[PDB]
């Protein structure tokens, strides 16, 4: 980061611009909110239209039944209408309860996402978006929340001839942090995610037993960082 700070800043600004452009293209990106509102609106709309149902009665409005029949004979028609309407309203309430439970699960997921992705850095793979997660920026929305997951994605690759360990004078040498790679002739110890090659000192590497037991080990002379200091 401290060597590529300007490049990272430029990439981040470009990424924010690109996501802004994508948001300024179509509403199909917000395909979840446009469903949590449309399903409730459609449920209310189809609950409204159940008042226009005969349900067996000779009419559909309670003012045109009590204006035609008398109580002892209108009560059966009203009972028909009321049981039908109560059934419809109970169905709507049950659908709303199920959808509210699903939305509760989604809100628990959003709460844990905000508690881990935003308020820290999650080690969970592909939880806060594809790739390694740096930081997240919560943003409001109509009946929802949208996260802008900043992610770390390795761009360009390069093959290397690796090695599990290194024989020096019979003693094995394993890298404490990183892997051993070779650009064809020499050897280097580098961090896993980024290709930053360094020489194999005694700091980057630790010894463990002999080197005739490990499988796939190669030969090299590990540069002891004290030889010029002990010569003088």
């Amino acid at each position: 980061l401290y060597e590529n700070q300007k490049l990272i800043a430029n990439q981040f600004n470009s990424a924010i611009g690109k996501i802004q452009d994508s948001l300024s293209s179509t509403a199909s990106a917000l395909g979840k909110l446009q469903d949590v509102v449309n399903q409730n609106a459609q449920a209310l709309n189809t609950l409204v239209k159940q008042l226009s149902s005969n349900f067996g009665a000779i009419s559909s409005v309670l003012n045109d039944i009590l204006s035609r029949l008398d109580p002892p004979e209108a009560e059966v028609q009203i009972d028909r209408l009321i049981t039908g309407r109560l059934q419809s309203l109970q169905t709507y309430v049950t659908q709303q309860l199920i959808r509210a439970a699903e939305i509760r699960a989604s809100a628990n997921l959003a709460a844990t996402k905000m508690s881990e992705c935003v308020l820290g850095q999650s080690k969970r793979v592909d939880f806060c978006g594809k790739g390694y997660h740096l930081m997240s920026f919560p943003q409001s929305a109509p009946h929802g929340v949208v996260f802008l997951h900043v992610t770390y994605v390795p761009a360009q690759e390069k093959n290397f001839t690796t090695a599990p360990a290194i024989c020096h004078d019979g003693k094995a040498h394993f890298p404490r942090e990183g892997v051993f790679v070779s650009n064809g002739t020499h050897w280097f110890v580098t961090q896993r995610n980024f290709y930053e090659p360094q020489i194999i000192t005694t700091d980057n590497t630790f010894v463990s037993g002999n080197c005739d037991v490990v499988i796939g080990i190669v030969n090299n002379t590990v540069y002891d960082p004290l030889q010029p200091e002990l010569d003088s």
Partner: protein
């Protein structure tokens, strides 16, 4: 029209027998694309506007999982990003 669970004996060349059912009104494409309308048993119909023949047509192709990859694993080769 997709006739599900029909022996297709009762309701040319527009048919295509899928495991879901024979799709009347769609021409099969032997190439596989990423599909947007899900149909059944790996078939997906889509609208194809072609300026040569049948500018309004619906094609029912087998669903494509993605670009097949052949990463070259070797016992001594590593790939570290730069």
């Amino acid at each position: 029209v997709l006739y599900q669970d029909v022996n297709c004996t009762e309701v040319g060349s527009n048919v295509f027998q899928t495991r879901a059912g024979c799709l009347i009104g769609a021409e099969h494409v032997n190439n596989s694309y990423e599909c947007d309308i899900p149909i059944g048993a790996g078939i997906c119909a889509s609208y194809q506007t072609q300026t040569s023949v049948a500018s309004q047509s619906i094609i029912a192709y087998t669903m494509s999982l993605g670009a097949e990859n052949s990463v070259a694993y070797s016992n001594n080769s590593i790939a570290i990003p730069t």
